[PDB]
Design a protein around this ligand. Sequence first.
Ligand SMILES: Nc1ncnc2c1ncn2[C@H]1C[C@H](O)[C@@H](COP(=O)(O)OP(=O)(O)OP(=O)(O)O)O1
Ligand SMILES: Nc1ncnc2c1ncn2[C@H]1C[C@H](O)[C@@H](COP(=O)(O)OP(=O)(O)OP(=O)(O)O)O1
Ligand SMILES: Nc1ncnc2c1ncn2[C@H]1C[C@H](O)[C@@H](COP(=O)(O)OP(=O)(O)OP(=O)(O)O)O1
Ligand SMILES: Nc1ncnc2c1ncn2[C@H]1C[C@H](O)[C@@H](COP(=O)(O)OP(=O)(O)OP(=O)(O)O)O1
Ligand SMILES: Nc1ncnc2c1ncn2[C@H]1C[C@H](O)[C@@H](COP(=O)(O)OP(=O)(O)OP(=O)(O)O)O1
Ligand SMILES: [Mg+2]
Lengths: 101, 647
Amino acid sequence: MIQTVVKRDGRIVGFNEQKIMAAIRKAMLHTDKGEDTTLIEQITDHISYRGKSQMSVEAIQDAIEMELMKSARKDVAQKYIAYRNQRNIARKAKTRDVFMS
Amino acid sequence: MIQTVVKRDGRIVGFNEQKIMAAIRKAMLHTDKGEDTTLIEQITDHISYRGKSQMSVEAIQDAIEMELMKSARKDVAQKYIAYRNQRNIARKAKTRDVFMSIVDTPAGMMMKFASETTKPFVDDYLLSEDVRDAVMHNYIHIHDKDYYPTKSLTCVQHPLDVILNHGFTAGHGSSRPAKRIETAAVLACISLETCQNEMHGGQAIPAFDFYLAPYVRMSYQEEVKNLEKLTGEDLSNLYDAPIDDYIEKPLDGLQGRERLEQHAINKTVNRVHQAMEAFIHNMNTIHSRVFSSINYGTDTSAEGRCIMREILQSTYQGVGNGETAIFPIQIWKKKRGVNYLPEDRNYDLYKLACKVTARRFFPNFLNLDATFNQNEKWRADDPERYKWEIATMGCRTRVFEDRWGEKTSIARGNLSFSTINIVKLAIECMGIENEKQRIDMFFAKLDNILDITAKQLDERFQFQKTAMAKQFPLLMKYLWVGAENLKPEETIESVINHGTLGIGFIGLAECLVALIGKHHGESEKAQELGLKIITYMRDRANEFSEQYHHNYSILATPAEGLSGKFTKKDRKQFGVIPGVTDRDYYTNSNHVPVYYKCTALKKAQIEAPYHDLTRGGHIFYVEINPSVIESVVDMMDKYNMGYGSVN
Ligand SMILES: Nc1ncnc2c1ncn2[C@H]1C[C@H](O)[C@@H](COP(=O)(O)OP(=O)(O)OP(=O)(O)O)O1
Ligand SMILES: Nc1ncnc2c1ncn2[C@H]1C[C@H](O)[C@@H](COP(=O)(O)OP(=O)(O)OP(=O)(O)O)O1
Ligand SMILES: Nc1ncnc2c1ncn2[C@H]1C[C@H](O)[C@@H](COP(=O)(O)OP(=O)(O)OP(=O)(O)O)O1
Ligand SMILES: Nc1ncnc2c1ncn2[C@H]1C[C@H](O)[C@@H](COP(=O)(O)OP(=O)(O)OP(=O)(O)O)O1
Ligand SMILES: Nc1ncnc2c1ncn2[C@H]1C[C@H](O)[C@@H](COP(=O)(O)OP(=O)(O)OP(=O)(O)O)O1
Ligand SMILES: [Mg+2]
């Protein structure tokens, strides 16, 4: 398993194992079917190996993608790669560089 | 196979296999490794055999993505499901407002962008942990949260004389003093609309009579000079000639030196008349293009009456082709000894004011003799009485008392205010059945929420200070108490304390229903609790004022930005309850609910004590001949009513 996560800004924090179950649960609400908790738990637990004890948030969100594209719920998969792309364009704004000015 | 595809617009075309192929090719050509026809052929053949006779573009793309997922090359789908979505958003922005969902005139759209960008950053990086926790669960509301990074203040009361007397210089713009009526209202408007950019609230001009009063004499003198330039006479004693009132009557029926003294007054009255309608039109158009307020009604000279009559006539007529102007907001001052009783000097102006208010809904009325507005320095002989007369704003705000300064409302303002949700606490405590324990729990929680609100207000204050003078070119050089002593680059920490902090409340009747079967306006026992809770809040406000070295007051919020922001989030969490979360309003601070049939007398009786208790702001709103408003004003005088707005 893993403990260290290096967020986008550059800080280091500890693994929580519960946030993932929120991200892979909010998407399934906008999908015409609220998937049973069994798949949430299975996918969450399947991120135990394949780690390195330190992985960036980009890696942990670019790996959960290639796990809903297999679990017979691609309906959820379609409405997960769209939201991420939406929010990766807003982050390019030079906004947090003005407040801290 | 597939033979007909229905385009998005609606056309029907034939199935061409060379278009499902180039699309995947372009998707593949940006994914490091870029493959050849080996998989393209498989995907296209699979699609074009399992389908129906006729298909749509969206269905075909669904099939493309579904097959591109169930493959070995999954790096080509993640560049498909993104480009398609970007194109959807682009083609949806030709008739809708997609750019707002992610986060009509151009200026309004830009302001919406800025507000939405600013709000979450403040909600995260600036507040503290306890305050943030309180805000998240719908316990309080911070008014005007989007201007937090700009160390901004709410409102002020303009000392309009300091600019008319001398010249004012802002940026590269400079202006000399005034020398007639037309060049005075224009400067008043300039200074009234120049300070909006420096503040996030309303604007007010107190003593609308005295400040412009010296400027009805100058035009008279100039007209006399012009009427004695040609005639060769020496009308040198007409300058400071005492006058009774600047009334105008026809001219034919005299001759000689008594004919060239009624004409001058006529031209002067017309000159003063045009200017006031120009003022009203300017302030009315600026809004659509800016809250404003003007106070008058306690000047017993000859020029003040002229100004009052001119403004009243212009407002009564209307604007344009007879429409009712929305701004400026006009407020009429009533005192017992100046304009109330039949023997008083300004009875006629009062009657005219009632006549106009019976139609165009302005001016409002402010009791200048209430038990909590009286001042012990108002001298009827001083030429500077206005310094000791309370003034109010269109937002229902009051700034009179002071623990470290004089008791005036000139050159002072408000700095922030936050409202507190009270219905939620009562609903939450509704669980237990025993009556006494419910009240005990209510009082137990109210104290903690009040402490959190006070801490938030103080932190806001601590942040607002540290603002350099140059950030506010006009407010901190001519229109604040300590100006004329501050260098361009000095902080404003030495003058900020001459301000006020408000704690508002909303929806008391619902809070009563959650602890008894009737609200304040239906059962005698009900009001004994509303009075008690308001009293508790006032006492805690006094304690906080003593603790933190600031000024704190209780407030009835104007209900302009927070009308349903609380009830919706409360129905969802707790669900429908009869008469508490079933109307989509939450009633105002302490009024009687609009859906309960009640008369003026009973409402006034139940409301006046709260007016006494809420120093930071209060109202008494009643919805309906000039004799009708007289009953309202008399009702205000009979009890300790402060600010009425019947219209
Ligand atoms: N401790 C963690 N370990 C691994 N991945 C994490 C962790 N915390 C968050 N993530 C990743 C995967 C989760 O699906 C997703 C949760 O939200 P996240 O992207 O961290 O939000 P955020 O940091 O942009 O915002 P917020 O401050 O609102 O939580 O982020
Ligand atoms: N309603 C939803 N629909 C689709 N995806 C969702 C939804 N709610 C959450 N998600 C996804 C998006 C992210 O992967 C994760 C939630 O993190 P979120 O804060 O929304 O994204 P983010 O890390 O891109 O944020 P930001 O860039 O704003 O800090 O779950
Ligand atoms: N002739 C066609 N036969 C089958 N599918 C088609 C055809 N034309 C378009 N499609 C479907 C499948 C393609 O994956 C998807 C994208 O087509 P594309 O040519 O990019 O858009 P379009 O035909 O609406 O017009 P445009 O030239 O503006 O792109 O549309
Ligand atoms: N640069 C690209 N990166 C990834 N995939 C792409 C790219 N360009 C095209 N594609 C793929 C995904 C698109 O759904 C498909 C059709 O492209 P295109 O004809 O430009 O779009 P479209 O017909 O949906 O848009 P439009 O609204 O302009 O008609 O080709
Ligand atoms: N709309 C306006 N906005 C700003 N400044 C204005 C505006 N209109 C006029 N001014 C200037 C002109 C003068 O500088 C000052 C008003 O002075 P005023 O009393 O009208 O006459 P004056 O001093 O120019 O007259 P004189 O020519 O007799 O010297 O404001
Ligand atoms: Mg005219």
